[PDB]
Amino acid sequence: ITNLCPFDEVFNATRFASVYAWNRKRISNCVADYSVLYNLAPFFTFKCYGVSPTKLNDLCFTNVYADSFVIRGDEVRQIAPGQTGNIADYNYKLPDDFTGCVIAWNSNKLDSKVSGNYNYLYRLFRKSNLKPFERDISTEIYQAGNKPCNGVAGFNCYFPLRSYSFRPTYGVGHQPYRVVVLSFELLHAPATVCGP
Amino acid sequence: TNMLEALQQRLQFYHGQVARAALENNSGKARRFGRIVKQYEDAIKLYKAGKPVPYDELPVPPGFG
Ligand SMILES: *[C@@H]1O[C@H](CO)[C@@H](O[C@@H]2O[C@H](CO)[C@@H](O)[C@H](O)[C@H]2NC(C)=O)[C@H](O)[C@H]1NC(C)=O
DSSP states (O other): OOOOOHHHHHTTTTSSGGGOOOOOEESSBOOOOTTHHHSOOOOOOOOEEOOOOHHHHSSSSSEEEEEEEEEGGGGGGGOSOOOOOOOIIIIOOOOOOOEEEEEEEOOOOTEEEEEEEEOOOEEEEHHHHHHHTTTOOOOOOOOSSOHHHHHHOOOTTTTSSEEEOTTTTOTTTTTTEEEEEEETTTTOOOOOOOOO | OTHHHHHHHHHHHHHHHHHHHHTTTOOHHHHHHHHHHHHHHHHHHHHTTTTTOOOOOOOOOOOOO
16 A cells, blocks of 8 residues: 555644544554654654654554544643543543554644634533543533532533633643644554555 | 632633533624633632622622522
8 A cells, every 4th residue: 555644634634623522533544654743843742652753653553543632731741641630531531551642732823813712622520530542522511519400500510511712812831732642553463554 | 608609600600601602603602701701700819819799790690509
């Protein structure tokens, strides 16, 4: 196979899915040239897990899954195996064993309107923490207190998810950072996403 | 119940309203709800600083229980 993998499509998307509903993309039957990430994207955080980036360009994979979402810069550190936090516990959870890369870069220019941005959403209230590599898009009202409500109200029911308010005025900590997560398994038995 | 719990309750409810408005892709509703949240966080900051909290100046809350 010689057709190139659609990494440019996922890294150049106009808008990324909200973290509570993080987009999952399948990459298969293509050659993956990761030198694009190093050559382009002047600002990035490519710190990866389970494989060295150069060796990553070297070896051959068999299953590549790309997860994309938007996270504030101050809490971008929560994307890691065995790490706690609101994002890790509620929106996106990575298993303790993990063989894949994480890429994060600021997107104030792209995802912060002058008046303000509210498209991106994240979850704050839920009964139990998320299992690894599991998605939760339910919008049911939380049972924070001891009073069942069945509808949004003042008392301890609340909305399960919260909206960001990104603005260019905010500092680097609160600025939105476009985060994409790659997942690999290097057993290579079918070897369908092999590199060059 | 005084004022602090009620203020945080209204703050959380209007944050949920902002999130719902954003989820519904409504722009102006989300902007107005965010402005209301801005005044409410200013009011809770003022009350934490010790300044008196008003009733009519802030928008009325929903049917809280
Ligand atoms: C779209 O993605 C690609 C790479 O993922 C970039 O667009 C161009 O890519 C070529 C390499 O194939 C570079 O030589 C060009 O310099 C890239 N364009 C620019 C403007 O740098 C780029 O990351 C994305 N496009 C834009 C407009 O950001």
